[PDB]
Paper text:
β-Propeller proteins are common natural disc-like pseudo-symmetric proteins that contain multiple repeats (‘blades’) each consisting of a 4-stranded anti-parallel β-sheet. In the larger propellers a so-called “Velcro closure” is found, in which the N- and C-terminal β-strands are part of the same β-sheet, keeping the propeller closed. This “Velcro” can occur in different positions; in the “Velcro 1-3” variant, the closing β-sheet consists of one N-terminal and three C-terminal strands, while for the “Velcro 3-1” variant, the opposite is true. Starting from a highly repetitive β-propeller sequence, we designed a consensus motif sequence that formed a perfectly symmetric 7-bladed β-propeller.
To avoid bad interactions between the close termini, the N-terminal residue was removed. We decided to position the termini so that a glycine residue would be removed, theorizing this residues contribute little to the overall interaction energy and stability of the fold. In the case of V22WRAP-T, this was impossible as the loop lacks a glycine. Hence the central aspartate was removed instead. While the space group and packing differ between the crystals, the structure is identical for each protein. The crystal structures also show that the proteins are highly internally symmetric with a backbone RMSD between individual repeats below 0.3 Å. As expected, v22WRAP-T is the least stable protein, reflecting the fact this conformation is almost never seen in nature. In both Pizza and WRAP-T, the “Velcro 2-2” conformation is the least stabilising, which presumably explains why it is rarely observed in nature.
Numbering used by the authors: 0 to 285
Write the structure that this text describes.
């Protein structure tokens, strides 16, 4: 619906961020909690303040931007694009690096917890790992279809990837495949680690979030969305799970799988969700 919405944990809408000229595909909070970054099919990243207003527009990608992330220190923004690149930007919106190496669209991006490695997911079926000088360090091969999302474990030693092959895969930094999470019945659209590292959450077009242990065994299936689930996130305290869906909602769930809230207000599909660092604000992209 071309907006980002900001909500509290009780379901109350706080702000609507208007200005993108096409779909918003992803959202992230800065580590100080004051700035929100959004990615859009209009080929831009926008930076917004939590009071609801646009600060900056980062132009430069030549196709849709599919995801955005902040470094742990807040000083670098990473964006993924169908132009086959990841771009790294400073907080002035100046372009620092373009990471080239993927041979098709880049669908997601994440920073390692130490801020020194970037992971990218691509339709070329790979995850690539990079440093902040744009140098390619490793390619993770094994998915049999497009990779849709990527995340680092809190200790930084395990990478999780989501794929249209219906799996999540877990890897080390040397590119070794460690575990495959098999169980979704359609494409997996996103993956996240709990802050203690002991639960993995995955989102799927099968309309569920699944929760798994670190051996890749299914622990719970969260049912309730009425269309594809497009993203998932854990709150910083680990006590709340957020899911985004083509049913136009975000749902909030406790760790026991109980539905806590549905965030209703977007007028089209929700494509991503994020928690503020204090865990009290949720951002949704649509």
């Amino acid at each position: 619906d071309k907006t980002v919405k900001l909500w509290n944990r009780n379901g109350q809408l706080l702000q609507t961020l208007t200005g993108h000229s096409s779909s918003v595909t992803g959202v992230a909070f800065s580590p100080d909690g004051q700035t929100i970054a959004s990615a859009s099919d209009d080929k831009t990243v926008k930076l917004w303040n939590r009071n609801g207003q646009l600060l900056q527009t980062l132009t430069g990608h030549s196709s849709s931007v599919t995801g955005v992330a902040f470094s742990p220190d807040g000083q670098t923004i990473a964006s993924a694009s169908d132009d086959k690149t990841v771009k790294l930007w400073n907080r002035n919106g100046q372009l620092l690096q373009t990471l080239t190496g993927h041979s098709s669209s880049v669908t997601g991006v994440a920073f390692s917890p130490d801020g020194q490695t970037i992971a990218s997911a691509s339709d070329d079926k790979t995850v690539k790992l990079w440093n902040r000088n744009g140098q390619l360090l490793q390619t993770l091969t094994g998915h049999s279809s497009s990779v849709t999302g990527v995340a680092f474990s809190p200790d930084g030693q395990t990478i999780a990837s989501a794929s249209d092959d219906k799996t999540v895969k877990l890897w080390n930094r040397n590119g070794q495949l460690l575990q495959t999470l098999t169980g979704h019945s359609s494409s997996v659209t996103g993956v996240a680690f709990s802050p203690d590292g002991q639960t993995i959450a995955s989102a799927s077009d099968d309309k569920t979030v699944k929760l798994w242990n670190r051996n890749g065994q299914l622990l719970q299936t969260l049912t309730g969305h009425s269309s594809s689930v497009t993203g998932v996130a854990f709150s910083p305290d680990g006590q709340t799970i957020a899911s985004a869906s083509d049913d136009k909602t975000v749902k909030l769930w406790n760790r026991n799988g109980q539905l806590l809230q549905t965030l209703t207000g977007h007028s089209s599909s929700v494509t991503g969700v994020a928690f503020s660092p204090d865990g009290q604000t949720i951002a949704s992209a649509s």
